[PDB]
Design a protein around this ligand. Structure first.
Ligand SMILES: CC(C)C[C@H](N)C(=O)O
Ligand SMILES: CC(C)C[C@H](N)C(=O)O
Ligand SMILES: CC(C)C[C@H](N)C(=O)O
Ligand SMILES: CC(C)C[C@H](N)C(=O)O
Lengths: 212, 422, 416, 417, 416
């Protein structure tokens, strides 16, 4: 039986298609594992949530948020959160797909996940930005957990947003859970070595090649 | 605060829901600023549902569970299995459950689910594994105090049994009230087969009183003779009204001396329809609408009452058994002729009232007799009609509009009292 | 076909045997059969208890959950030196049937501790009971496995279960156990319902076969909570109670007994006023009604020959041997089975639990009604299923119960 | 008698202790029961931070006391008032244990409060405070552990924020964690006008019992909140002459009867009576048949009691009437109706709200009324029955009744852990 | 500005005094100051115990969580007649600071019960401890509130906390409490960590400021687990322990005591082999190092005038009060504050928790090494900070703690 491409994206043709094509180009090399490939072209879970926020002027704005779990076989979902006015569902699906790939490529015990809020953070006050992160964090609460889904920074998010997510979750759950997100400030269970990791990594892998 | 980007410009049925919210704002008073919340589903969960097929291959199906609004209680609404199930569709339908649940006064928000599948292509075993996997997948949403699914298009007692069992085994507790529409054996309610028809009568009769119309000896025309239609028929008959005309997809029968619904039913069961019923005369399809009757019950397809037929309707009262049997143009026409239209949202809400009774009984697995069911059924629909009637008079608006006003007001009042948190 | 209990197979074998007979007369699908012939789970617990002298003693306990197709497990707790795993299974399976007969939303369960409760200080017994329920908290609860009273376990035992569960779980949860004191969400009242229920059933059945209950003579075997209640209500309903009996013998008076006065002397001393009869002479007495209200295996094939009752009412589970029943039915007696006349306490528990969950309690007279109309409804259903099948009462009840169990099981299906 | 000692403001607790010890002499109470009764299970003080309108954090202090839960989950109102202390909360929680018991409800006793001037915060500050109080309590409250309820400075709107905060934290619609909700949210019907309706139902039963009539009896209502207003209102419809009402500012007096419609209307619109006739303390000494204490605690002390002319004194507010003033009024022959009896309407109404929220099935206004009335009557008759059994006044018969129900529940359940 | 304890504010008010002084020398946000000045939650429990004679006695206990900005709450338990809410509050706040000075991911907490532990039988005490932990199950845990040892609460007490909690929750949860026995998930290092820490700190500070330690004379005030360890390690590192003291008085040997011999005698007989000194004289000996390793308030302003030591090492919390510290600093003494010396118990407890959480236990060697590395780091950070602001050791530590608390607090913000 055929598994039809996802109905909810439209007959186009964007970032999700580029990801599935990458899945396709890999299938000749999979051996006995090939029939399973289809599952890679299927997110486990897509949660679209409404994130309401009382603005400074006391009115209520409503933002679109997303948390997608692409795949969960190797472990819990891991992936950052993007805050960008041009973020779409299908973009987040794609990115969640790439995280499944990237996590497996280095053999981290993680599935792949991503989230996004359709918002221009430049246009929000720091106070509104915080209420945004807190409400989103409550809304995806049913997904979250150090053994379930672990968000992280991405485009337009960093330490500040990760600090609010960690706090929101811990208060919501009645215990201190540093490992519910990554990219936190050192003061909150951050790690040393975050700033140089990727550059150093570029070197480590280049040297490993030189070796060969 | 701009329109939902994951629908693209391709609105469709969600925009229909959204427009109806717009149409109600003029009536909201100090609640109108909150109206935007109704244009946003609290949440949408799209799940992959993988099923091991009888031949040993794996098939993958998109499933949806939508919580449209949650101000008045847990999400409530059925699950549909249809190959044309779209995200937009489920959302629109979750919206309509919020409205309906509030208009009738149930302590429920609105929900709906769908799997995009053609159940006919699947064996009983595959449909089972489909059902169980969907209910595991939406397991983070389910619970007697969180979300309670139900039957809808291509689902019924059989699937609900499966959902309850799966949820119960998954959670290690027996929890009959996680879904409704179950069989009696597993904690369903008595009184389900006739609830909707019965309720059409209950609502028409309440309307009748407001205008001094005697039910006894009143003439009734009914379109559709399925579960709703024939339940309405018997309910009308057993209160002394005469059924003079039934219309089917097979034809129209007419008899001014009355047609006995229980006898028509034997004929419809035997022959598939009303055509050739021996104790009535055949009637041209168009003349059905113009019959001189007191009560008209459209209980079949949608848009049966249109521009093209509205002007001929002589009935004092139209009680909608089916969803959307009458167009906005016909609304405006019937409004001018002075005929009361009891709108579907309350008029056919008997089904969902009994579902709610099932859920109440499930809390302690203590079950009501059928007479208790019908007694409380009456209470709910009479109260719902009285409140719809009250707002129609206060605001000088038709019953259909009044019903949405009540619904949206009740939802928004609950949101306003609870406040915005977190 | 079929779980084998490692020891003490008796009660399970009897259950099995009745099931085999009822399959020939009832629509039951293989899957249902398979489930009914294998208890879902069997838990043996070791129960450490620091005794009064400060030394540790371990007791052994059981909880068996049979079949759960109709709802959460419901079942009693025995405190008795005779308690075994085999006995517990049999009883758990019997509950499943008895609940299905009463059309109750319960599956069947049973549990016990192997102890003589009279040989412990009340302090020691409290500890034993509390350890039992603590070891069980992750396997029981109001929508899971609801415990209840049985041999050597009364209202005070049920209180300790309740208190122990609630303190651990950390919220107050009256629904985990039935047969509680009124103060803690029990009632109303009874405790006294098993006997009441027994008479209600006998009533409706006598009324249906044309039989003098008007001043007819009754013999009651057993004077625990159930028998005391039967005797008590039998007198007030205008029956003449000629005999009562215990594991010591029987007190007899041919014109009737002053029952309240007897239970007073019995409750005072632990013995009957006078002993006119040997423990087995009781069965062969001249009376219209023999009621079995003590323990399983009370009446064997041989002793049934001596019986001249026209009505034999089995209240204690398995009080009446398969073989004694066959003979009395052949002689033409009305034989009322445990599954029917022994559901009073189960019904009362159901009613009790409903109210607990709701946390709203009916008046004494609202309970009575609801109880009474339910007994009548199930007597009616057993007879309708009997009639249609051309069956005695047991087989009727068995086929009715099986049909409901079949329906729940096939609708739910196999999962996981 | 060995008992818990509150470190601050022990007045209300001490009173409870006095009554416990008197009642001990006339009711069968085992020593263990007495120990549980004399030491609250748990007293919780919270620091409640709040972002004020200016953006500065201010921290408030709140309390939650569970006294005793032998008879079921704890029930307890929440006070938002500048005089809220741990001491008085302790006293109120224990009073709840007894009250619940007298009314035969399956509840233990609790109480809560925050030391705040609610009228002094903005609507948003008040809301944030109530939410924080609730979030801090989430793991310790719930529909079968500790069920919150209204009290001084705590509205149906406040109850809503409590229900909502809990529900959002726990991720389920849970109406039964609090009572006194708006009808829309799982609230029950009209009552709470229940405190006042109840007060009068108790008076009426106690009168038809001792063969008095209230047709044209003169009533002084001290207090005009939810409670007093309804007393005044209900007194008027039973054909009593309400001769004075009194707020914390003073009282308005008409020897021939006040138009209760007129006075309530003005007070609701402006916060004042149409005219001030008496300073607040002069209202007790008025020539009337009935005196209703429907304000705060310690309203009528020992000496001001020497001024009372009224034959019947109805204590509705908890500890409205001081023990020294109850003795004197009893000496002089007056009928004294205790709070444990006549202050029990709100609690009973709340119980009925709770019961309905358990299965989310709502009775009609008339069903609610009927069930409310029969339980009041059963409670009045039970208290009177226990009183005449042992030759006691109402308070004491009530206390006896409570202690023996508490003792039964405590003895059966035992010590554990 | 601040929470006011209703009972016993001494320790709390001392905390406020240091806090107010430290504010002037560290960058601290207003909102941080708010949190630091009002403890999150103070809870008082009534604790029923069934006494040996069968009568129920109710004890009073406490658990206060002061501030959780930096992680889960961590705090000891006192079984002592002097326990009050105010004391527990003060100790909880001191814990927030201590933990912050040590760069530990802990908030501050403290608990206790008003009881003389010697005055109960072991059965009565075990019951009292179990009721305490039972009543706290919903408010404590390996990531909520982690308990540990303190005055009158030894490793056996910790065992009972752990067990009770683990039996309640149905899971084995070592990380609910620290100071446990080795058999139960305790750490090798050590429950003599308080003492070693005190000395590792001391030796580190003398190395820095040219103070010669081999052959320096040490006086130790106090001889429980803390003092004993101080004395043993001071001798190991080549110092002369000229005096050790208890509340009865002191033993003195100008040549330096045989520490192990003196402690053998103390353990064996419950007394020092001889008593040269009155309790007063202890502080007035001629020595290089005086160690406060007993109880709060040991050295006040008057007694400070007695001290002839170049270095005074506060190990007990609040061993010396602000007034004695000012005086001794004015005289040129090195005062090592409790926030630094004897954070050793707390650091070990932390290393215990880390090991419990992933159930893998380091060698006595490996614990020692991670323990040393961390005290050397803490001494470095505190000194670097003191020096940048030209402050004394206490102030530097204070400013460090406050800066770290302010970071965690401002980053997390106010929520709910
Ligand atoms: C249930 C909802 C109407 C209210 C909720 N506090 C929210 O912000 O979404
Ligand atoms: C009989 C029922 C409990 C069925 C259940 N799904 C099982 O397989 O055990
Ligand atoms: C509720 C209480 C009266 C009983 C409980 N076992 C306790 O020790 O606290
Ligand atoms: C410092 C943090 C623990 C702050 C926390 N989110 C609160 O508002 O209480």
């Amino acid at each position: 039986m055929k598994s039809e491409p996802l109905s909810y994206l439209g007959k186009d043709g964007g970032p999700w298609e580029i990801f599935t094509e990458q899945v396709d180009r890999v299938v000749p090399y999979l051996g006995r594992l090939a029939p399973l490939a289809e599952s890679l072209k299927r997110p486990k879970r897509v949660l679209i949530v409404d994130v309401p926020v009382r603005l400074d002027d006391g009115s209520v704005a409503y933002f679109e948020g997303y948390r997608v779990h692409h795949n969960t076989a190797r472990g819990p979902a891991k992936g950052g959160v993007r805050y960008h006015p041009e973020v779409t569902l299908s973009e987040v699906m794609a990115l969640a797909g790439w995280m499944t790939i990237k996590n497996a490529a280095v053999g981290l015990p993680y599935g792949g996940g991503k989230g996004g809020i359709r918002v221009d953070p430049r246009k929000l006050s720091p106070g509104e930005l915080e209420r945004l992160t807190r409400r989103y964090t409550s809304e995806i609460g049913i997904l979250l957990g150090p053994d379930r889904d672990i968000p992280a920074p991405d485009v337009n998010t960093g330490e500040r947003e990760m600090a609010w997510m960690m706090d929101t979750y811990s208060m919501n759950v009645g215990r201190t859970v540093p490992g519910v997100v990554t990219g936190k400030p050192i003061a909150l269970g951050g790690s040393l070595g975050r700033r140089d990791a990727t550059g150093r990594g570029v070197f480590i892998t280049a040297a490993a090649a030189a070796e060969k | 605060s701009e329109p939902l980007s994951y629908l693209g410009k391709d609105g469709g049925p969600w925009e229909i829901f959204t427009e109806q919210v717009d149409r109600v704002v003029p009536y909201l008073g100090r609640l109108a600023p909150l109206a935007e919340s109704l244009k946003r589903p609290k949440r949408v969960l799209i799940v992959d549902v993988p099923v091991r097929l009888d031949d040993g291959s794996v098939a993958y199906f998109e499933g949806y569970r939508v919580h449209h609004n949650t101000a008045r209680g847990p999400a409530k609404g059925g699950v549909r299995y249809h190959p044309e199930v779209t995200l937009s569709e489920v959302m629109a339908l979750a919206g309509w459950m919020t409205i309906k649940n509030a208009a009738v006064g149930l302590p429920y928000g609105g929900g709906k689910g769908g799997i995009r599948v053609d159940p006919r292509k699947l064996s009983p075993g595959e449909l089972e594994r489909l059902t169980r996997r969907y209910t595991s997948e939406i397991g983070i949403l389910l619970g007697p105090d969180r979300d309670i699914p139900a039957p809808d298009v291509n689902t019924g007692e059989r699937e609900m049994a499966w959902m309850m069992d799966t949820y119960s085994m998954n959670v290690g507790r027996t929890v009959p009230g996680v879904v409704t529409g179950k069989p009696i054996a597993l904690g369903g309610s008595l009184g389900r087969r006739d609830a909707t028809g019965r309720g059409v009568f209950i609502t028409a009769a309440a309307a009748a009183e407001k205008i001094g119309l005697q039910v006894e000896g009143a003439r009734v025309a009914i379109q559709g003779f399925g579960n709703v239609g024939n339940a309405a028929a018997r309910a009308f008959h057993d209160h002394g009204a005469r059924v003079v005309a039934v219309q089917d997809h097979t034809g129209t029968v007419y008899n001014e001396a009355g047609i006995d619904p229980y006898d028509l039913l034997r004929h419809v069961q035997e022959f598939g329809g009303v055509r050739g019923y021996p104790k009535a005369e055949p009637l041209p399809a168009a003349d059905f609408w113009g019959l001189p009757v007191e009560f008209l019950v459209p209980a079949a397809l949608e848009k049966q009452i249109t521009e093209q037929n509205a002007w001929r309707i002589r009935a004092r009262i139209v009680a909608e058994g089916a969803n959307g049997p009458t167009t906005p143009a016909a609304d405006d026409i019937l409004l001018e002729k002075g005929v009361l239209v009891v709108p579907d949202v309350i008029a056919n809400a008997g089904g969902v009232t009994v579902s709610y009774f099932e859920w109440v009984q499930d809390f302690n697995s203590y079950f009501w007799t059928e007479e208790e069911i019908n007694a409380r059924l009456e209470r709910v629909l009479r109260n719902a009609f009285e409140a719809v009637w009250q707002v129609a008079q206060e605001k000088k608006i038709p019953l259909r509009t009044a019903a949405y006003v009540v619904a949206a007001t009740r939802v928004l009042e609950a949101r306003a009292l609870r406040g915005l948190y977190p | 076909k079929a779980y084998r209990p490692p020891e003490d197979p008796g009660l399970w074998d009897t259950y099995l045997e009745w099931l085999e007979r009822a399959l020939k007369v009832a629509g039951v699908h293989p899957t249902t059969l398979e489930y009914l012939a294998h208890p879902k789970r069997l838990v043996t617990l070791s129960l450490p208890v620091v005794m009064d002298d400060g030394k540790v003693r371990i007791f052994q306990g059981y909880r068996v959950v049979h079949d759960i197709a109709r709802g959460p497990a419901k079942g009693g707790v025995r405190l008795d030196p005779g308690v075994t795993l085999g006995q517990t299974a049999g009883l758990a399976a019997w509950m499943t049937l008895k609940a299905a007969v009463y059309d109750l939303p319960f599956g069947g369960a049973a549990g016990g501790i192997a102890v003589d409760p009279k040989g412990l200080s009340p302090q020691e017994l409290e500890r034993l009971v509390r350890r039992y329920t603590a070891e069980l908290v992750g396997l029981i609860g109001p929508d899971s496995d609801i415990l209840g009273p049985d041999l050597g376990a009364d209202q005070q035992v049920m209180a300790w279960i309740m208190d122990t569960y609630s303190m651990t779980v950390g919220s107050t949860v009256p629904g985990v156990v039935t047969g509680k004191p009124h103060a803690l969400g029990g009632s109303e009242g009874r405790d006294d319902a098993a006997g009441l229920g027994a008479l209600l059933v006998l009533e409706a059945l006598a009324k249906r076969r044309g039989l003098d209950l008007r001043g007819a003579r009754v013999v009651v075997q057993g004077l625990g909570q159930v028998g005391a209640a039967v005797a008590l209500h039998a007198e007030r309903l205008g029956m003449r109670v000629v005999a009562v009996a215990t594991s010591m013998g029987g007190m007899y008076a041919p014109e009737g007994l002053d029952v309240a006065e007897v239970l007073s002397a019995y409750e005072a001393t632990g013995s009957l006023p006078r002993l006119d009869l040997a423990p087995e002479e009781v069965f062969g007495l001249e009376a219209e009604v023999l009621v079995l209200a003590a323990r399983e295996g009370a009446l064997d094939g041989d002793r049934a020959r001596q019986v001249q009752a026209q009505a034999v009412v089995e209240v204690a589970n398995f009080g009446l041997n398969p073989e004694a029943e066959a003979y009395l039915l052949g002689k033409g007696a009305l034989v009322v089975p445990d599954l029917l006349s022994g559901g009073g306490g189960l019904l009362a528990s159901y009613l009790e639990w409903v109210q607990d969950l709701n946390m709203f309690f009916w008046s004494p007279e609202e309970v009575r009604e609801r109880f009474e109309t339910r007994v009548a409804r199930v007597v009616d259903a057993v007879c309708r299923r009997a009639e249609r099948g051309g069956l005695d009462l047991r087989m009727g009840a068995l086929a009715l119960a099986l049909e409901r169990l079949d329906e729940a099981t096939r609708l739910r299906g196999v999962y996981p």
